[PDB]
Design an enzyme around this catalytic site. Sequence first.
Site, short mmCIF file in Angstrom:
data_model
loop_
_atom_site.label_atom_id
_atom_site.label_comp_id
_atom_site.label_asym_id
_atom_site.label_seq_id
_atom_site.Cartn_x
_atom_site.Cartn_y
_atom_site.Cartn_z
N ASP A 1 -3.45 -2.71 -2.96
CA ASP A 1 -3.07 -2.67 -4.07
C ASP A 1 -2.10 -1.77 -4.67
OD1 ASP A 1 -3.43 -4.10 -6.80
OD2 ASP A 1 -5.19 -3.01 -7.37
N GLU B 1 3.92 -1.81 -5.67
CA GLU B 1 5.06 -2.29 -5.98
C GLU B 1 6.26 -1.55 -5.74
OE1 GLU B 1 2.06 -4.86 -7.13
OE2 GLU B 1 2.19 -2.81 -7.89
#
Length: 847
Positions: free
Chosen positions: A425, A428
Site C-alpha cells: 500500500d 505512489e
Amino acid sequence: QCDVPPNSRFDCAPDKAITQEQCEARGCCYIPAKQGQPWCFFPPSYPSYKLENLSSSEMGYTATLTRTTPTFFPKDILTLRLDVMMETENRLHFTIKDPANRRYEVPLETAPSPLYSVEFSEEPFGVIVHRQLDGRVLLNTTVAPLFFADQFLQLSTSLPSQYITGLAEHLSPLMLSTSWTRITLWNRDLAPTPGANLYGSHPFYLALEDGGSAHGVFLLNSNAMDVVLQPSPALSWRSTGGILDVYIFLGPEPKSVVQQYLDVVGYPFMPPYWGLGFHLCRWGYSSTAITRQVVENMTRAHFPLDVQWNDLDYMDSRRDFTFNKDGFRDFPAMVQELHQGGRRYMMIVDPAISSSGPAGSYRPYDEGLRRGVFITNETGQPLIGKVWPGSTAFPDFTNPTALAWWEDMVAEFHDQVPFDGMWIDMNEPSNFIRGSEDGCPNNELENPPYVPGVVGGTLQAATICASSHQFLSTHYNLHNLYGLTEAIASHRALVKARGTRPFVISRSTFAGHGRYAGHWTGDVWSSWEQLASSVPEILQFNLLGVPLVGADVCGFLGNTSEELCVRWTQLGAFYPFMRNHNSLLSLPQEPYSFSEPAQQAMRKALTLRYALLPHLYTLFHQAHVAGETVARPLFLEFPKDSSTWTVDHQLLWGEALLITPVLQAGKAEVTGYFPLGTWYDLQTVPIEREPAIHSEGQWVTLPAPLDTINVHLRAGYIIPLQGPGLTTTESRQQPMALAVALTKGGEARGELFWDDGESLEVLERGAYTQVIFLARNNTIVNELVRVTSEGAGLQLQKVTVLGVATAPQQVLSNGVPVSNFTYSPDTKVLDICVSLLMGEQFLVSWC
Ligand SMILES: *[C@@H]1O[C@H](CO)[C@@H](O[C@@H]2O[C@H](CO)[C@@H](O[C@@H]3O[C@H](CO)[C@@H](O)[C@H](O[C@H]4O[C@H](CO)[C@@H](O)[C@H](O)[C@@H]4O)[C@@H]3O)[C@H](O)[C@H]2NC(C)=O)[C@H](O)[C@H]1NC(C)=O
Ligand SMILES: *[C@@H]1O[C@H](CO)[C@@H](O[C@@H]2O[C@H](CO)[C@@H](O[C@@H]3O[C@H](CO)[C@@H](O)[C@H](O)[C@@H]3O)[C@H](O)[C@H]2NC(C)=O)[C@H](O)[C@H]1NC(C)=O
Ligand SMILES: *[C@@H]1O[C@H](CO[C@@H]2O[C@@H](C)[C@@H](O)[C@@H](O)[C@@H]2O)[C@@H](O[C@@H]2O[C@H](CO)[C@@H](O)[C@H](O)[C@H]2NC(C)=O)[C@H](O)[C@H]1NC(C)=O
Ligand SMILES: *[C@@H]1O[C@H](CO[C@@H]2O[C@@H](C)[C@@H](O)[C@@H](O)[C@@H]2O)[C@@H](O[C@@H]2O[C@H](CO)[C@@H](O)[C@H](O)[C@H]2NC(C)=O)[C@H](O)[C@H]1NC(C)=O
Ligand SMILES: *[C@@H]1O[C@H](CO)[C@@H](O[C@@H]2O[C@H](CO)[C@@H](O)[C@H](O)[C@H]2NC(C)=O)[C@H](O)[C@H]1NC(C)=O
Ligand SMILES: CC(=O)N[C@@H](CS)C(=O)O
Ligand SMILES: CC(=O)N[C@@H](CS)C(=O)O
Ligand SMILES: [Cl-]
Ligand SMILES: [Cl-]
C-alpha cells in the site's frame, strides 16, 4: 488560415490563460467558442519539425527532424532523430530522440506482409500508419505540431472512431469521452472519484474501428502527462519529460491487440490457486484473538475463506517488519495455526520506513541507512516525509542495494511470522505532507513549465519532492514507476523467502505491472455508484494485463448496507481478485454479520465461485501463457456486434460466462445485452426464469431478486467445476464435474489446466496436466494434451449437459450404462453420474 472546424482545433495555449493578442503573437488563431474547446489554436501553418534525410535499412527507417522556429516553451530540442522499427507483422515501433544527449528512458526489458504500412509527411512532419487490409488511417501525427522541449513533449493523432479505452487509472466508463477530456497520469493517493489522477498510470489505449477491428498504442513514457481527447476525433499525448517511444499494435481483433501489447510489457504472472479464494480483511482487527474470531465466525456459518488478512493493527507503532507485544504478542502462533487449518495469511506492508527511533533500535531503518537504500535530497541525506508511523524515509527501489535490503527485511520478518504474500500500500509514494519535512527546493523539476492536470496543481502534492535523487534518475522521471518497482522488489523477495509463487497485491501500478503483481482499486466508498463503477474498472485493468484485480467487496469507506453488501458480494464473486476489506471507522461487513437471508445469498455467491475455481484458474493460465484477459468486456469477445461497444455493466469470464449483475438499490430485475446465440442459465446446473435465452443480439430483461445474480453459459462451451470446501486446500481434493453447453448442432468445447497450485517454473518444467473436452453427435470425450502426476487422480463424477432436446433412453460411460442420470423435459438438462478420471480417456454417450 484560421478556418479550422471547432472540433479540430488543437490548443495553442495549454500552459496558461491567454489573450487574443498573446495568442496571435504566438502565431496562433483566436476564435472564441460559442458556449473545453480551445479559443487559441494552431493554424495548419504553425511551425513544426521538418523531416530530412529519410533513409531505409533492414529494420525500417531513420531520419532527422529539424525545428527552425522556437515554440513558446523553453528549451526546444531543435534537432531530433526519428527511428522506425518494423518489428513484427503486428507491431510497429518508433522513437523520437535527441541525438546529441541521452535523455531519460523507462527501464523495460525487450500473404507475408505486415498488417500496417507507414508513410511520412515532410513539412509539417508526421508519421502516418494505415491498416493495409482496408486502408484505414490509424495514426496520423501530421494533424498538429510536434513539440519536443526538455520538459514538454507533445504528439497528436487522429483517432479512427469515437471509441477508445485505456489510460488508467481513472474512475470512468470503459469507453473514454472524446468531448475535450484531459486525462492525467501521475500516481496519487486519492480515494477514487471522477476527473482525478488516481493511484496508477498506464499510457496505453485501444481504439476501435468501424466493423470491429482495433489497434493499440503504447507510449513508453513514465513522466507526468496529460492525454487530451477531442471530438474530431483526435488525441494528444502531452508529457513533461523523457522521449517519444511509441508502439502500435495492429490486432486486428481487440483480443489480439491486448495480447500484442502484453508481448511488449509482459504477460500476467500466474497466481497461486489459493489466491483465487476469498480474502477477508479490515483495519480494526486489533488483536490475534479478534482476528482468530473472524475465521471461527466464517467457519461456524459455512462461509469459505482461504486467506485471513491484517491491516496496520499488527505492527509495533505502525512500523514495517515489527509486531506489537500487546494484542499481537502471539502473532507467529496465529499464522502457524491458520496454516494448520489449510488457510494462508496476508498483511499490509508500507514502503516508507520510520526514521525517528533511537539509533540502533529499529533494524530496517538502521540497516537501510548503512547501505544507502533511501531516496535522498539535495544535500545527499535521506528525504524525510510523514506517513503512518510519523517521520519516514522512502526506499529507492531502482537501487540494487535497496532490492537486496528489501529481500533481507522480508526474509527476516518471514522467519518470525510465516506470511504468504505482501499487500503493498501507500506506494505512489504517498506522503502526508508536501514534498518533505524540509519542503522542496526551487528548481525546474519542482516548478516545471507545464504542470499536468494533477489534483492539488503541483507534482509534490501528497508525495515527495520531484528533484529528489534515485539511483536511475530523479523522482521526476521515476515517480510513476515507484509502485511497480516496489512490486518487482517484493515479487523477488517472496520468491527467495518462500520458494513458491509470489502473491503481491499493490495499490500503485504502471504499465507492465501484471507481470509481477495484482491490484485492488483502493479506497472506494460503500455506495451503489462505486459498486457500478467497479465493473468498468476491473475490465480496464484486464485489458491492461493486470487480470488479478478487484475492488473491496461491500466497499471500503463509510458504512455499507445489507442490500448493498448482498449485491456487492454477488458481483464481487466474479472479480478475479475477491477480497472484502473495510475501514477502521466503519460498521462490520463480514458475511456472518448480516441477517440470515443475506447470509444465504452471500454463501451462494461464494459457493458458486469456489465451484468455478478450476475454470477461473484455467483462465489465469491462458492469461499467463497467451496474454488473454480473464474478466473481459463483451466487445472483446463480440467486437463485430457494435451494440456491445458501450456495454460495461456486464462482464464475461473468458469466452463463455456472461455475468449480468444488479447494481442499483431496490431492483428485482436487470436488463442486459445478449450477443447472438443461445445462453443457458447457469442455475440449471446442479451445485452442492427461462432455462435458455435465445438471442438475436438484443437486450433482455431478466428476473433478479435480491437472492439472485444472473449468470449465463454460452452455447458451444464446456466448463470444469469442482466440489465444495471452506478452503482451496479442501476443495482441490473434491471430485470434479463438467457443465456442457450444447449448440443447436450438438457441439461444445472446453478445457482444464491443472498443476500443484503453487510451484515455480511449472510450464518450463512441464509439471502440469492439460485436458480438452469435446461434445459432438451425442458424445462427450476428453483429449489428453499433457498428463503428469499433478493431474492424476482428478475424479470426474458428474456431467451436466445443457440443451438436450429429447429424453435419452440410455446413457453410457465407456460403453456401460451409468449408475444413474436424470433428464428434465422443462429445462432440457441431462444430469449424469459417472466414475471417471480427468487424466484418462473417456467416452460418455446418450440416445
Ligand atoms: C535533507 O534531508 C535532511 C534529513 O535527512 C534534512 O535535515 C533536517 O535539517 C533541518 C534544518 O534544515 C533540521 O531541523 C533543525 O533541527 C534542530 C535540532 O532538532 C533545530 O535546533 C533546528 O532549529 C533551527 O531552525 C529553527 C527554525 O524553525 C530556528 O528557530 C532555530 O533557531 C534553529 O536555527 C532545526 O529545526 C532537521 O532536524 C534535519 N532533519 C533530521 C532528520 O536530521 C535537510 O534539511 C534536508 N536538506 C534539504 C536541502 O532539504
Ligand atoms: C493526415 O493529416 C494531415 C493533416 O491534417 C492531412 O493533410 C491535410 O489534408 C487536407 C485535406 O486533404 C489538406 O487540405 C486540402 O488542401 C488542398 C490543396 O491545397 C485544398 O484544395 C483543400 O481545400 C484542402 O484545404 C491539407 O493541405 C493537408 N495538410 C498537409 C500538411 O498535408 C492528411 O490528409 C492526413 N493523411 C491521411 C493519409 O489521411
Ligand atoms: C542531410 O544529409 C546531408 C548529407 O550528409 C552526408 O551524407 C550522409 C549520408 C552522411 O554520410 C553524412 O555524414 C554526410 O555528411 C547533410 O549535408 C552535408 O552537411 C555537411 C555538414 O554540414 C557538409 O559538410 C556537407 O557538404 C553536406 N553535404 C551535402 C551533399 O549537402 C545535411 O546537413 C543533412 N541535413 C540535416 C538536417 O542534417
Ligand atoms: C458509520 O456508522 C457509525 C456508527 O453508527 C451508529 O451505530 C450503528 C449500529 C447504527 O445504529 C447507526 O445509526 C449509529 O449512528 C458512525 O459513527 C457514529 O457517528 C455518529 C454521528 O457522527 C456519532 O454520534 C457516534 O458516536 C458514532 N458511533 C460510533 C460507534 O462510531 C459513522 O459516522 C458512520 N460513518 C459515516 C460515513 O456515516
Ligand atoms: C464473532 O461472533 C461472535 C458471536 O456472534 C461475536 O461476539 C458477540 O458480539 C456481539 C456484538 O454484536 C456481542 O454483543 C456478544 O456479546 C458477543 N457474543 C459472544 C459469545 O462473544 C464476535 O464479535 C464476532 N467476532 C468478530 C471478529 O466478528
Ligand atoms: C495443507 C495444510 O494444511 N497447510 C498448508 C497450506 S495452508 C501449509 O501448511 O502451508
Ligand atoms: C452510471 C451508469 O451508467 N449506470 C448506473 C446507473 S444508470 C448503474 O449501472 O446502476
Ligand atoms: Cl481577450
Ligand atoms: Cl536521467
